[PDB]
Amino acid sequence: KVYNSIFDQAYEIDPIPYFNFLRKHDPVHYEESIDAYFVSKYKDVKYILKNNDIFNTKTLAKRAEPVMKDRVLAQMSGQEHKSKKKAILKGMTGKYLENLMPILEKRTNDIINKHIEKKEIDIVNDFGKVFAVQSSMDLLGINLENYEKIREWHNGIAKFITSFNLNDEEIKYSLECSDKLENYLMPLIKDRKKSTKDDLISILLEYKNDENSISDTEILALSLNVLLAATEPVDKTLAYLFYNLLKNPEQFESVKNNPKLIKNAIIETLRYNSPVQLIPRQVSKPFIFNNTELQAGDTVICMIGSANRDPEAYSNPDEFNIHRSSTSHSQNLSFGTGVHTCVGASFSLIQLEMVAILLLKRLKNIKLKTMEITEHGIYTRGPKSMVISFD
Ligand code: HEM
Ligand SMILES: c1ccc(-c2c[nH]cn2)cc1
Secondary structure, eight states: OOOOTTSSSHHOOOOOOHHHHHHHHOOOOEETTTEEEEEEOOOHHHHHHHHHEEEHHHHHHHHHHHHHHSOOOOOOHHHHHHHHHHHHHHHTTTTHHHHHHHHHHHHHHHHHEEEEETTTIIIIIIIIIIHHHHHHHHHHHOOOOGHHHHHHHHHHHHHHTSSSOOOHHHHHHHHHHHHHHHHHOOHHHHHHHHSOOHHHHHHHHOOOOOSSOOOOOHHHHHHHHHHHHHHHHHHHHHHHHHHHTSSSHHHHHHHHHHHHHHHHHHHHHHHTTSSSSSEEEEEEEEEETTTTOTTTTTTEEEEEEHHHHHHTTSSSSOOOOOTOOOOOOOOOOOTTGGGOOOTTHHHHHHHHHHHHHHHHHHHOEEEEOSSSEEEOOBOOEEOOOOEEOOO
């Protein structure tokens, strides 16, 4: 019998002591409430994610279908997955990327311009929440007329994607969010169909696989997948980045003095406070990790934050240090690994660096006003608020 549960209230408050207990004493940990095994060690998480044939993404189909309306990218495999992942990458690289970043600079500067005279800003609620959804819509090609309603509908769909055992009233609200978003987006996919632009929806629209376009509802599903994914972790990461730097003045100074260190500071923030905390997989056949037996059909959930703090992977893993280099250092698992590694990983780092540079440039002598954050979410996780002041 076990007494340390992922679903104790203490875990969401502060999961770090759970990571340390689980890695040492129960590295493949069963939770009866969701009939799943939680996997906490870097080596086991890496092996599971690298072996797409033994640990497959069928678990995601059950948690994605009701709100995304058709198959998402992580559910695909083989040539379909490879080619469609490439199409998605295309919208955020090359000339698509060069066109997009000035627009995201405009989004950044318009937010700053709204708060600059107030001499404080909430990096979570004033900047990240607003910027993340506008950014996703700019990437997709959706005009910002309705970013108010899009934000609301994104939030309900995210709640569904990132929760366990929701109550019937909650599922209802999340499905009405998903319907409203579909009711909004479907006509635009059809307008883009005969008036093609240079955005991600147009890429999906002109995608062809053996002279066979993908259905409109498949395009909707992929677009919904990108909208949700490009929005949710990016805003948490930005707030974590400035909180961690401000909580370590010496490292904030090194960043200020040498802006090239911002990328390393972003990477270390993703390692330290992994915003996507869980990755589920289904076990395809009998299998054993450590001495825990798994059966075909079992669910394993990789614990990204725990893996990224594994002392087998990193020296002093529970310390934030932007100067980590190279066991005492490994590649973090913040973006996963293997077949389903985050298509938006490079774009994420570029987005966050350009936003970080503008905040440092325009807000002078930043000081922390939220001296102690509170964090929420066990699937995705971030501060509820993170206020700074400036000159
Ligand atoms: C800090 C920001 C981000 C983090 C921490 C993050 C994290 C992750 C992780 C851990 C995975 C692996 C999921 C799995 O293996 O099942 C993933 C996959 C994915 N991410 Fe992100 N992501 C970020 C930003 C983005 C952005 C900006 C996009 C824009 C499209 C995006 C889209 C995707 C997609 C489509 C997948 C599925 C890719 C595939 O199945 O091959 N992500 N992400
Ligand atoms: C749940 C699972 C994965 C994500 C995700 C992947 N890439 C960006 N965001 C968001 C919510």
